Amino acid sequence: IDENLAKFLAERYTPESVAQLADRFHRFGFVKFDAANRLVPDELQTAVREECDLLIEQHKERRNLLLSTTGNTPRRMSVVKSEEIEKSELISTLSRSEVLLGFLAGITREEIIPEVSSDERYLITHQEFKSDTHGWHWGDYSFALIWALRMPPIEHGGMLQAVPHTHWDKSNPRINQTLCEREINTHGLESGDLYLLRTDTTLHRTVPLSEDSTRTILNMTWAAKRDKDLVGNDRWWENPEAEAARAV
Amino acid sequence: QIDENLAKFLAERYTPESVAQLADRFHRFGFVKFDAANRLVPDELQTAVREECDLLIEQHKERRNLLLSTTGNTPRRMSVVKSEEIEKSELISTLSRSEVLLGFLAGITREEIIPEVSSDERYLITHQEFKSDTHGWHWGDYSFALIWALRMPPIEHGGMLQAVPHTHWDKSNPRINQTLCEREINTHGLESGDLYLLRTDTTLHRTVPLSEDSTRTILNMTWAAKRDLDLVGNDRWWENPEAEAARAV
Amino acid sequence: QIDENLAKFLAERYTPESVAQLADRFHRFGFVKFDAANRLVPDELQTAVREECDLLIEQHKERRNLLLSTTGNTPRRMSVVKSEEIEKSELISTLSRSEVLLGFLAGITREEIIPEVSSDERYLITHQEFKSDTHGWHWGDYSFALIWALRMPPIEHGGMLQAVPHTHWDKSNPRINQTLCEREINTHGLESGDLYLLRTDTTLHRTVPLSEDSTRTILNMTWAAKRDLEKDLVGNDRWWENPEAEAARAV
Amino acid sequence: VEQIDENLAKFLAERYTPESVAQLADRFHRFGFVKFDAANRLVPDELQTAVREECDLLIEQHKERRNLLLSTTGNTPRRMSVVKSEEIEKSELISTLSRSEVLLGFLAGITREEIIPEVSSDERYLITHQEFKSDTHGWHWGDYSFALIWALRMPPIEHGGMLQAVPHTHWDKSNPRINQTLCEREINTHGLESGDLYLLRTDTTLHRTVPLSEDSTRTILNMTWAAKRDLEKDLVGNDRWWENPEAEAARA
Numbered sequence A: 001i002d003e004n005l006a007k008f009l010a011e012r013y014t015p016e017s018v019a020q021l022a023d024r025f026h027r028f029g030f031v032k033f034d035a036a037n038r039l040v041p042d043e044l045q046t047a048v049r050e051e052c053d054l055l056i057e058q059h060k061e062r063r064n065l066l067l068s069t070t071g072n073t074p075r076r077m078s079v080v081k082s083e084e085i086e087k088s089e090l091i092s093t094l095s096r097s098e099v100l101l102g103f104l105a106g107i108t109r110e111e112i113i114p115e116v117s118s119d120e121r122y123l124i125t126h127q128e129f130k131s132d133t134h135g136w137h138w139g140d141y142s143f144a145l146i147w148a149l150r151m152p153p154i155e156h157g158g159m160l161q162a163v164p165h166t167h168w169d170k171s172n173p174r175i176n177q178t179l180c181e182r183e184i185n186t187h188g189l190e191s192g193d194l195y196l197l198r199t200d201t202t203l204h205r206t207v208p209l210s211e212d213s214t215r216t217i218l219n220m221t222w223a224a225k226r227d228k229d230l231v232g233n234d235r236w237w238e239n240p241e242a243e244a245a246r247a248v
Numbered sequence B: 001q002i003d004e005n006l007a008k009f010l011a012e013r014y015t016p017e018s019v020a021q022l023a024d025r026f027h028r029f030g031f032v033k034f035d036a037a038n039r040l041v042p043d044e045l046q047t048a049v050r051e052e053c054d055l056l057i058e059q060h061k062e063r064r065n066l067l068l069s070t071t072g073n074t075p076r077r078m079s080v081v082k083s084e085e086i087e088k089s090e091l092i093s094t095l096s097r098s099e100v101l102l103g104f105l106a107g108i109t110r111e112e113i114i115p116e117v118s119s120d121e122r123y124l125i126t127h128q129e130f131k132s133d134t135h136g137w138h139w140g141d142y143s144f145a146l147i148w149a150l151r152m153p154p155i156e157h158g159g160m161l162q163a164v165p166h167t168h169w170d171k172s173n174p175r176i177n178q179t180l181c182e183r184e185i186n187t188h189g190l191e192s193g194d195l196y197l198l199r200t201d202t203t204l205h206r207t208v209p210l211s212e213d214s215t216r217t218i219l220n221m222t223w224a225a226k227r228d229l230d231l232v233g234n235d236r237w238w239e240n241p242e243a244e245a246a247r248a249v
Numbered sequence C: 001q002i003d004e005n006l007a008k009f010l011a012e013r014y015t016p017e018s019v020a021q022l023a024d025r026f027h028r029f030g031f032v033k034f035d036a037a038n039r040l041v042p043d044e045l046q047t048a049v050r051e052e053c054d055l056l057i058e059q060h061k062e063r064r065n066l067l068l069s070t071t072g073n074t075p076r077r078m079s080v081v082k083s084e085e086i087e088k089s090e091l092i093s094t095l096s097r098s099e100v101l102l103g104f105l106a107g108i109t110r111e112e113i114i115p116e117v118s119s120d121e122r123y124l125i126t127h128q129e130f131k132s133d134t135h136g137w138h139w140g141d142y143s144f145a146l147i148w149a150l151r152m153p154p155i156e157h158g159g160m161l162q163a164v165p166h167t168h169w170d171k172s173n174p175r176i177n178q179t180l181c182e183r184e185i186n187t188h189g190l191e192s193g194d195l196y197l198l199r200t201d202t203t204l205h206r207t208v209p210l211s212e213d214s215t216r217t218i219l220n221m222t223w224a225a226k227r228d229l230e231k232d233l234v235g236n237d238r239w240w241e242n243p244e245a246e247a248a249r250a251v
Numbered sequence D: 001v002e003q004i005d006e007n008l009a010k011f012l013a014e015r016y017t018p019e020s021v022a023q024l025a026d027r028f029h030r031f032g033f034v035k036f037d038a039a040n041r042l043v044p045d046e047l048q049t050a051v052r053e054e055c056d057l058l059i060e061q062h063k064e065r066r067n068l069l070l071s072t073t074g075n076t077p078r079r080m081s082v083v084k085s086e087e088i089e090k091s092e093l094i095s096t097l098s099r100s101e102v103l104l105g106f107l108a109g110i111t112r113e114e115i116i117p118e119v120s121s122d123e124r125y126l127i128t129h130q131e132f133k134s135d136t137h138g139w140h141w142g143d144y145s146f147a148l149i150w151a152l153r154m155p156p157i158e159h160g161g162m163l164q165a166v167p168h169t170h171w172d173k174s175n176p177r178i179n180q181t182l183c184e185r186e187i188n189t190h191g192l193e194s195g196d197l198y199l200l201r202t203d204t205t206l207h208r209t210v211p212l213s214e215d216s217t218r219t220i221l222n223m224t225w226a227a228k229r230d231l232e233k234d235l236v237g238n239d240r241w242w243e244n245p246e247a248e249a250a251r252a
């Protein structure tokens, strides 16, 4: 388990090459683990993708709303709640793995602490229809490891768009204005990829799907020392009737 | 008339040195904005143009709702007024060929602006009204467009110009989303009364979709460079909604 | 009485919202400038600081003309005043530990600013006077520097700050010129009286060499972040305190 | 010789297509710069060897040391040796290749406009040859639009000698604003290896070579061409320091 990942990473990374990833993580708020920079063995990834497949078919929940705390940006997708995913022993132990968190802490350059609100530890988003999107937003917590389990071709949409070095003002998000002042980075993803995101200071969204395509991710959210008290009444993934949500 | 008036308006607000700085920005971004800090036409001239356009819209508005295969099937959801209709405006047509207007902007393009383009693309009015209306990602067939931001929604409703300079249009392989993955997007917010010069052939651009029923109106004056003086694609959707490259939605 | 007046000076100019915007710029560029549009200290306070430094310069300036091996043999061609001389100044030393100043700037760093650094690096004055004087490409050992641009030449004479944020310092392989080949350089012009906050550990930086015999004078207040505590100093490259440090080479 | 164009046309046809040249044209407009390295050779290795050997003989015979400041570019230094255009034109190979219809035709696909080999006779060709610590080609623009630069010999990147570039700028000789432009714009640094070639948009790209940090050799050949916008142009500035060390704009 841990011993297999410790050996797997030891053959694919050096302190020097991980320091280069830390540069790119702080510069873009984003670092991708693809065929050239794998993070988990293919067996470990298949097991997690299989467990997520059983969880989607069993507990998927449609969402279609505008979130007021992010300028009424849309959330049009299906979700599997954190409390359901936590029952997967595989996903639960892996998210708290001392080998995994220790390795990525060399990229964040600060302690990764698996202590977040129990409704936000894990989240699966499953998009299926044209115009499905995870609109522009920030996270309440500092870190997220995103598993790009199933990604459509880039021509169908689903790319991550990001503006790093921003912050979330839930009473004045200024999202389109911040786009007008800042260059947007678009990150294309392939199935099997993973990426680490600095969610609290990186404004981000997924580009809306142009046709009916399948886009599935797993979100493992972690805290830094900086993450306190939650606010906004905007927990739309856990509560579709949240005060900040406006149904569509 | 307007030429002698425009020449004096520009001479009080620009030097060759400051035009050269605009030429820097126009080559760097494919875009230079004529806002309240850098006016291009007197307020009376724009009011005349906008009034002519609002009549052309009220009379000749033609709704467009399609996908364009030559630009990766990006949408065109708007109303248009065709060039032949707009060319009936003596004002818009005369202004678009003004040797004072073109001579000034040629200090920004650093090359001759030639008012010799196809008779169906000399002028275009687009007019977005409903949620999700957009002028999707595309290039122009010609080098230059002077865009009149006659009416702009508030930025929180969308309608911003997004642009990626230093690209080109391959109609058999546009690679729009792949180009976005490789390049940074510049977003240009626009207020009513703004104009901007756009390098349309090498700047991939779109307008951000309307997040709510809002009004977004522009006039497009398209010009050629010496490099533009044979068309292809079968994709002239604004003049012909039944173009071979237009798909239905 | 410094902290009481400084807190008023800052409360007139800054809000949590405006500081958050500065924190965004500080994270993005490794650098936020406190110029005429964003003053940090009252003019009478900076004047007092600058006169302390000119006295220290007149009494304790030492010429440095060397290359540093831990930063790719980049030059240090300047005069300096050592930290232990500057710490004798009651004004500078107490200001550098001001809970009001450090508390304010911590809203830009978004983390605690800790005035616990090596006694040979709490303060540094660099004083360049001659053509080709430069503070060559380098990083700092600590996270933070507040730089007082006490005297700046005209921009056409050089002396600008050049910076590449989001980098790191490997003293055995600093890769200075290779990093410049892979990254864009931000040049920051400074005027006399400016101050700026610098993320010194992850921002590769230098001062553009003087093209004329002009005078360029700064005060460097260096502080630690939590990450810097307990960590060990390596490199044998403390050239400002020891001109014949092991990593220093003749120029 | 004589059969150089027939072979060069084949060499390019093996490596380049209109689609792939169109990608290079996008980079050239964006950066003012496109590099021909091992992944994208421009000329056969035998042909570059002949050009380098020609340049080595021209250097040993006709080099001239320069150490000055140029006022039309803000007193930035020129600290190097040079070989002037009239001496380089005596090489039948270099002079023929610089007007090659195959070479110019190919590069015109990257410039997206005609490349015209009609420039001032003192500026058709230039070899710069740096040898000593602090040697540099200081920040400047060119009077003409295009230059193909042959990086015949380049030191290790740790020793300096990289190209730095700020594209989408302009040269005002009475007020060049070198350091002000650097404050407003990001600097692109382009490292080079011996054997590389690159195309540069010299009239709108502010550029220099990073000063050598120690005694190393850095040797380039500069083939300068015009665009239509440079034709019948009045040369101004009195700053042609490579031809005339006593040029009015030059300062010792």
Ligand SMILES: N[C@@H](CCCC[NH3+])C(=O)O
Binding pocket: A067, A070, A120, A123, A137, A138, A139, A140, A219, A221, A237
């Ligand atoms: N706050 C985010 C949701 C976080 C999902 C769980 N980490 C948003 O506005 O969409």
Ligand SMILES: N[C@@H](CCCC[NH3+])C(=O)O
Binding pocket: B068, B071, B121, B123, B124, B138, B139, B140, B141, B145, B220, B222, B238
């Ligand atoms: N080529 C443009 C149309 C421009 C018409 C006016 N210049 C498009 O596909 O949207």
Ligand SMILES: N[C@@H](CCCC[NH3+])C(=O)O
Binding pocket: C068, C071, C076, C121, C123, C124, C138, C139, C140, C141, C145, C220, C222, C240
């Ligand atoms: N590390 C710096 C010296 C900083 C001393 C004051 N913080 C250098 O090598 O130049």
Ligand SMILES: N[C@@H](CCCC[NH3+])C(=O)O
Binding pocket: D070, D073, D078, D123, D125, D126, D140, D141, D142, D143, D147, D222, D224, D242
């Ligand atoms: N204008 C350049 C010289 C270019 C000569 C060769 N094309 C300079 O000032 O250094």
Ligand SMILES: [Cl-]
Binding pocket: B140, B220
């Ligand atoms: Cl258009």
Ligand SMILES: [Cl-]
Binding pocket: D142
């Ligand atoms: Cl040159």
